[PDB]
Structure 1
Amino acid sequence: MIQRTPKIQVYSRHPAENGKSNFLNCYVSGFHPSDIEVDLLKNGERIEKVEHSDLSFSKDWSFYLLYYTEFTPTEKDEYACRVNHVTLSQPKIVKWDQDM
């Protein structure tokens, strides 16, 4: 068996074809086993609607998740990723830095 803790990155992107659109992204990478729970949060509450969730693997024992959706941030709001995995004894919460 092998188990690997995911790396978690949270960041925002505008598609170059429509620069007015802003997306909040969470790249959850290099994890094993594949079983996992991943949420975006706004001021601590779960965002129910996330339009994209794209899973892949490299080696048979290494998975990658891109989880992202359109959003309209303000300076007041705090956004975060919340990840549960068997390698994590407590849910891991990674805050979005608004400059990223």
Structure 2
Amino acid sequence: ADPIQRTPKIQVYSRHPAENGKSNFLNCYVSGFHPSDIEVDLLKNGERIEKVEHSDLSFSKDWSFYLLYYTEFTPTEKDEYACRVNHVTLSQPKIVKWDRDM
């Protein structure tokens, strides 16, 4: 491969301490990847959550790219979540299961 490619580093997390019951935001912060175009979507129990705004596409000193997604959801101790991320890579899209620990 000649076009210097860089694959994204994904993290999914709550903006504040997750206390299922009340509102907060679902964040998926993709960064460290390069080739601009990136498809990042949210998920709920398996489907595609919507009406999600994203950040002002900027980069790091290493000319790497970073984007942040976030939504207005109501945390519950039974609604499994994960981030949907696919971009110029090898394997199939990448889904990141949200976890209490991080």
1:81 to 1:60, Cα distance in 2 relative to 1, 3 A: same
Q: In structure 1, what is the Cα distance between the partners aligned to 2:26 and 2:50?
A: 14
Cα shift at 1:52: 3.7
Q: In structure 2, what is the Cα distance between the partners aligned to 1:46 and 1:20?
A: 21
1:93 to 1:25, Cα distance in 2 relative to 1, 3 A: same
Cα shift at 1:54: 3.5
TM-score (norm 2): 0.82
- Structure 1: runs of 5 or more not aligned: none
1:97 to 1:36, Cα distance in 2 relative to 1, 3 A: same
Q: Deviations over 1:47-99 (max 9, x none)?
A: 12113433211247310001011110111101110111112420111111134
Give the conservation status (yes or no) of the 8 Å contact 1:33–1:61. no
Q: 1:10 aligns with which of 12, 37, 40?
A: 12
Give the conservation status (yes or no) of the 8 Å contact 1:12–1:25. yes
1:72 to 1:16, Cα distance in 2 relative to 1, 3 A: closer
Cα shift at 1:20: 6.0
RMSD: 3.2
- Structure 2: runs of 5 or more not aligned: none
1:19 to 1:6, Cα distance in 2 relative to 1, 3 A: same
1:54 to 1:41, Cα distance in 2 relative to 1, 3 A: farther
1:36 to 1:70, Cα distance in 2 relative to 1, 3 A: same
